[PDB]
Each structure stands twice: as C-alpha cells, then as structure tokens.
C-alpha cells in the first residue's frame, strides 16, 4: 500500500532529527565540568522516622512550606506528617487501598490521591467542618493512575497507565487537554518550576515534553533501555532527571534537547524507583529497588553520597523546597526524613 | 506549649485509630481474581458472591470475611501493579474448559487454554507470588463434559490427550495445569471443576483459605 512509503518519510525525517542531534551534540556535561567542585561524601543522617503507616508505602510529597509531609500506603491512610516535631496532622481514610501517587497542593489545602481505581481523588484539608472531606472524584482514565502533581491551585495535571497524561480542574471536573502521544503506560510526572511545561515518564522508555495547555510533544527524549519509572525536573533551568529500571538516572536538556550523560554504575543492576533533584540541581538523589538510596553529582555522576538503610525498596523520594531535608518513603512502613 | 501537647494528643488519637484499623485489616482475608478470559470468570465470581482498574468484592461466609479483587478490567501493563498484591493470602484463578474448538475466536492461532497456561505459569513462577497458593477454578465443566464425547481433547493440543471420556480429559487438563508450577514445595494449587452449585464453590474457597492459613501458622510456629 502507501503506509510503507509514509513510514519511509517518517524515517527520513527521523534521520534529519538524528543528524541535528549529532551536529548540535559535540561535547558532554562531563566534558564541560570534568572535575568542577568534587562533592565527596555528604552522607546525611536519619534525623526523623515516621511509622504511622502499617503496610507498603508507595507515594509521598512535600508541601510548599517545607515542613508538612503527605504520604500514601497500601492501607487506606493518607496521614499528614509534621516533620519538625514528628506529629500526626490528619489521617485520611482512602477508598482505594491501591494508591501509587499522592501530591500536596502548593496552596497547602488539598491533597490528590490516585491508584488502581483510575481516579484522582482530591481532599479538602482545611475544612470548616473539621474533617478532611473529599472535594472531587476526577475520572476518565482507562488505566491506573501513576502521578497526580498539582499544576496549580485548581488545575491539576496527572499521568495514567492509559498512555495519556491528562490535565484536570478541581473547579469543573472536565478534561481540559488530553496530551496524547505516548506508546506505553506513563509512570511519572514532573512539572516545570514555572509550571508552563511538564515532562512525563512512560513504559516506552522515552521522556516527552508537553505544554501546560494546548500542546502535544515539543521534544522527544529517547536513549533509555527498559522504562522510565520516575522523572524529576531541575530546580530552575532546562533540565530534568530520568530514572529507569536499567539503573541509569540520565538527564536531558531542554534548550538543546540532547542527552548529557548517564549515571550508570557497575555494581548496581537494579532499577530507579524515585528521583527528586536537590537544591540548585547540583546533586541527584535517586531511589532504588535494592533497599537502598544514593545521591549522585548531577554534573559529575559518581558517588556524592549514600542514603541507604531502608529495609525494603525505596518507593518514593522527595526533596524539600528549602532543601533542608530529604524524605525517603520506602516500601517498609516507615518514613525516614534524612537531612 | 499547651497547643503542642494538644497536637501530641491528637497524634496519639491518630496513632490508636490507625492501629485499630491495621488490626482490622490483619483479620481480613484478601483474595485476587485472575480471569484469563471473560467467559466463566463472571459466572464464578457471581457464584462466590452468592471503569476502575480494580473492583473490590467483599463478602462473608461462615464468619470468614473475604475481600475479592477483580483486575479483569485493567487494560494496562500487568507487572507495574502486580507487586501491589504481594501480600494476598490466596489467588483465585478462573478458567473455562468450554474454549477448545474456538481458538480464542478472534486470534485463531493460540487457544484459550494456551493463553490460560501462559497467564497461569506467569503468575505461578512470578517473584511476588513465590509462596502464594492458587485457587484453580475450571468453569463450564458441564458444557465441557457435554461436548467432550463428540470432540476429544486431542484438538487443543496435538499431543495425545487421553480417550474421549470426560474423566481422562479432566485428568489430563488438571495435570497440564498443575505441572506448570515450579515451586510445588512452597505453593500448591487447588483444582476444582466449577459447576452450577454456587454454595459449594464458596465452601471450597473456605477449605482452600483454611488450608493456606493453617500452613501459614505451621511455618509461623516453632516447626517448619
């Protein structure tokens, strides 16, 4: 038929894309910052430990205030943690006992909850009635939800296993933008600092840049092998870290849409479960499925530090906005808030 | 501070609330439903009770509460959420025998049996289920035994499939199912030919759950 020649045109334009890739790619992040500021060892300490949850812990997100903490586990609990004093703020019963994502609203009054029910559930923390009551029951995904990051106060973007990263709205529970294009199920979502863009991580092992609204793929980001389990974003810039099962937390630039270098290690054969950039993006804290957590030099790879000590697989890792702490929500039912 | 002590008291109340809730979840018996095809799984799930990716069927029978989980309507990658069901006490596998001579009726290359064995051994030797027993349910046994005389079980696989008798056919399919598991020392399957008697399927599920619980206690105790 003609699909063969149409795919040939697609292949030739892909060849032009790779020609531009190779032409613009002449050096590496290592080739620039060979031996600039050797971090050394910054091995931090288990400052606090939260043990409210009693089952497999999957998600956790820091708040804007850099103090309050949210986390979701297998049991239908969404306890709000007061990290500074190791206190319980709000234990939220959860209809879906299979949640793998939870996010704190930047305004500090809402928490989203996804999971295996394909529903992004939003709860109102500040209630004149006094109890956390569910505000919305966003639905429409044909697959399991994977991330529910609050794009803004009312608009919320989310990622599901239906290969679509939908954008929602608490004010009116309608689908603003589909953001289609992904081939495999999408695993993770990280917003831009200015929230006018966001990246998605999929099971097709390709990060993909989208606009906040009225957008499809601006840039395609291939180079991984197995699947993008988790993704992050630079604190302020055209960069984002990409975690995958193939043990490489590689990162890509945005203004240059090129691969920089891979955070590969000979000893590590396991995968990357969670990645959240450190302040200024100098480090790269990576979760692992070998009951360990380690941080990398974001510009020099290598062992900047080791954050290990968790019994089970590190499921979620988050870095505070102030940068004064790092929380590791491993599958073992404790939250160790490292320094 | 006074407000600090009040917050600590609130955290203590939260702690006891989550403690009692987790204790409640401990007594819960949670089973997972894997229907290879949407032909007999609905019938058997109706039997044991009497677009979310998971449907939580909860019921009781003779003072034992079962929280059934239906993941038939997932339409997504299995291994991404399969680790969420690592702690299930039992796996209820449902597969019909009224599938041969149709060959998936859409693919015409592999049988529902072949797809079912693929699914079954993928579950059995799966890392997250290295010690979880499987409740094997053989659905539409009445129609299978009705049509087995007119067409032998030699059609589904060209290998000799016994005589045309339903007894030999059932024995061969049961063996071809159990031998797929590679960890019979730790996990053992419960074959059962599902029939119109709904209550008997529920009591068979009770016997299976009692069995898995008693050997769980066996290893939990000093012996084993």
């Amino acid at each position, epitope marked *: 038929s003609e699909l063969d020649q149409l795919r040939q045109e697609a292949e030739q334009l892909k060849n032009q894309i790779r020609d531009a890739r190779k032409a613009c790619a002449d050096a590496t992040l290592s080739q620039i910052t060979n031996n600039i500021d050797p971090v050394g060892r910054i091995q931090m300490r288990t400052r606090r430990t939260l043990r409210g949850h009693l089952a497999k812990i999957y998600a956790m997100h820091w708040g804007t205030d850099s*103090r*309050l903490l949210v986390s979701a586990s297998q049991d239908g609990k969404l306890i709000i943690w*007061d990290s500074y004093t190791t*206190n319980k*703020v*709000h234990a939220i019963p959860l209809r879906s006992s299979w949640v793998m994502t939870c996010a704190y609203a930047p305004s*500090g009054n809402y928490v989203a909850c996804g999971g295996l029910d394909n529903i992004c559930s939003i709860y109102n*923390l*500040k209630t*004149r*009635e*006094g*109890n956390v009551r569910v505000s919305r029951e966003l639905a429409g995904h044909t697959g399991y939800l994977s991330c529910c990051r609050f794009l803004d106060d009312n608009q919320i973007v989310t990622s599901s296993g239906d290969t679509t990263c939908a954008l929602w709205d608490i004010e009116t529970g309608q689908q603003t933008t589909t953001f289609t294009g992904h081939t495999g199920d999408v695993m993770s979502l990280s917003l831009a600092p200015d929230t006018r863009l966001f990246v998605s991580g999929a099971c097709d092992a390709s990060a993909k840049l989208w606009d906040v609204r009225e957008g499809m793929c601006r840039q395609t980001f291939t180079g991984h092998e197995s699947d993008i389990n988790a993704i992050c974003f630079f604190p302020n810039g055209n960069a984002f870290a990409t975690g995958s099962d193939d043990a490489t937390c590689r990162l890509f630039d945005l203004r240059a849409d090129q691969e920089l270098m891979t955070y590969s290690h000979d000893n590590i054969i396991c995968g990357i479960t969670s990645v959240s950039f450190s302040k200024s993006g100098r480090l790269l804290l990576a979760g692992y499925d070998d009951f360990n957590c380690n941080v990398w030099d974001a510009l020099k790879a290598d062992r900047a530090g080791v954050l290990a000590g968790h019994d089970n697989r590190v499921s979620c890792l988050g870095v505070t906005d102030d940068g004064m702490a790092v929380a590791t929500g491993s599958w073992d039912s404790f939250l160790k808030i490292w320094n | *501070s*006074a*407000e*600090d*002590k*009040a*917050a600590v*008291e*609130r955290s*203590k*109340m939260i702690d006891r609330n989550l403690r009692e809730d987790g204790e409640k979840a401990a007594r819960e018996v949670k089973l997972l439903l894997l229907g290879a095809g949407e032909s007999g799984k609905n019938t058997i799930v109706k039997q044991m009770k009497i677009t979310t990716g998971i449907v939580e069927t909860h019921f009781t029978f003779k003072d034992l509460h079962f929280k059934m989980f239906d993941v038939g309507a997932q339409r997504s990658e299995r291994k991404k959420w399969i680790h969420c069901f690592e702690g299930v006490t039992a796996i209820i596998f449902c597969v019909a025998l009224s599938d041969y001579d149709l060959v998936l009726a859409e693919d015409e290359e592999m049988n529902r049996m072949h797809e079912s064995m693929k699914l079954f051994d993928s579950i059995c030797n799966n890392k997250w289920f290295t010690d979880t027993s499987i409740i094997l349910f053989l659905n539409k046994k009445d129609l299978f035994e009705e049509k087995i005389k007119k067409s032998p079980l030699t059609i589904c696989y060209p290998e000799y499939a016994g005589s045309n008798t339903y007894e030999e056919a059932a024995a061969y399919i049961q063996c071809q199912f159990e031998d797929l598991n590679k960890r019979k020392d730790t996990k053992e399957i419960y074959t059962h030919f599902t029939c119109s008697t709904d209550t008997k399927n529920v009591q068979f599920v009770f016997d299976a759950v009692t069995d898995v619980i008693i050997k769980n206690n066996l290893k939990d105790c000093g012996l084993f």
Partner: single-chain antibody
C-alpha cells in the same frame, strides 16, 4: 454545622447544681477540644475549663477547680458542665468554644451563643489598658496588649488570640497567632505584635468593628483575658 446550642442556666440558688449541656451540630465533636468561658455582666471574659479530644486531658480554673466538673458525650455531641457548688461570683455568661490543635489549626474559631447564670447579685497578666474610646470610621485605630511573660516559645510562635464581640453577642476569632487571620474576617485586621507587646490595627473602621476587643494568651493552660474596649462609632 458548628452551631453550639447552649442549654442550661437558670435562677439557681448559691451552692446548687446546674447542668450546662451545650449541643453541637456535628463537626467531629470528638475531634475538637472544648472550652468553657464565663463573663459576668459587669466584668470581662474569663476561661473556666478545658477538655481535649476524647476526654484526654481536663483542666479547670483554680477558682473552679473542684467546684465545677465538665464532661463530654461524643456520640451525642454534647459537653456537660456540672456545678458542685454555686456562689455569687459564679454569676456569668457561659460561652463554650471549639478548638482543634495542629500546625494549621485555628483554635477558638467559633464561640457558642451562651447561657445566663443569674445566680445572685503567678500567671500571664493581659493588661489591655485600652478602654471604650469614641472613634470615627476610616481611622487606623490600634488596640495595645501587654503580657508579663514573652509569648514566644521555642516553636517560633506567640500564642496571642484577638477577639471581637458587639455588646450582647458572642466573640469571633480575629487573629490566632498575632499574625494569621481567621475565617470570616477581612484583611484589615492584623495583630502585628512583638514578643511581649501586642497590637491590633483596623485600617477601615466599621460598625461591625464597633465592639469590645479581648486579647488572649495560650502559652499556659490557665488562660487570661483583658478588659473589653468598645469602639463606639462616635
């Protein structure tokens, strides 16, 4: 809602016993801690007792430590104020309030209607030297409050509580940490106090702002009040 229907009072003789069982419309009454605040007709507000959530911790004023006993009924959402003994000084206006406690909490947000007890006719000192002063609208009036002990704790918060109630009504909470406004109040109100000095600026004075103002301290369990300063619109 959170409407606290006070129920009790009456023309009880001294030394008697009365039931003051205020009812709660339902706001997880178990979750919220309850207070009792009295007010004689010729005096200001005065705290009486406090029970935490689930009858955890019970506190009484040293004046009413053994005379008054307070208890709650979580399934029915009521708190029972028993008076073992009654005196002339117990003649007061009893308002019970709701107070939840966490990081983002706003205690003393709602005060009940209250019930009259027409019986008969070392700690932080909240001076509140301001009195009833005639002020025209639009003026940036300021109400000063002082305390003996610095309200600032190691947590970095000063437990100052500003209140407003027009003559004959029940107080609402304006500022609960000298800096953070409550619900139902405009941005004009603001404490902006120091570690030991406290104020309240009202940029645009209104008839709603007409009324006495009381500052509270919550560093210690025995709570202290000032003397109301009615801002008459004249």
């Amino acid at each position: 809602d959170v409407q606290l229907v006070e129920s009790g009072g009456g023309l009880v003789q001294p030394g008697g016993s009365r039931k003051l069982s205020c009812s709660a419309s339902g706001f997880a009454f178990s979750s919220f801690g309850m207070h009792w605040v009295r007010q004689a007709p010729e005096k200001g507000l005065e705290w009486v007792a406090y029970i935490s959530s689930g009858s955890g911790t019970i506190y009484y004023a040293d004046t009413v430590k053994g005379r008054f006993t307070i208890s709650r009924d979580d399934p029915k959402n009521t708190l029972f104020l028993q008076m073992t003994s009654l005196r002339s000084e117990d003649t007061a206006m009893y308002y019970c309030v709701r107070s939840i406690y966490y990081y983002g909490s706003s205690p003393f947000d709602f005060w009940g209607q209250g019930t009259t007890l027409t019986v008969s006719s070392s700690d932080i000192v909240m001076t509140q030297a301001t009195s009833s002063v005639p002020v025209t609208p639009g003026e940036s009036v300021s109400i000063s409050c002082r305390s003996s002990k610095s309200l600032l704790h190691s947590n970095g918060n000063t437990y100052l509580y500003w209140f407003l109630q027009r003559p004959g009504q029940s107080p609402q909470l304006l500022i609960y940490r000298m800096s953070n406004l409550a619900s139902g109040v405009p941005d004009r109100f603001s404490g902006s106090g120091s570690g030991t000095a406290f104020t309240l600026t009202i940029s645009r004075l209104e008839a709603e702002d007409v009324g006495v103002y009381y500052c509270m301290q919550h560093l210690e369990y025995p709570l202290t009040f000032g003397a109301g300063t009615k801002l008459e619109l004249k």
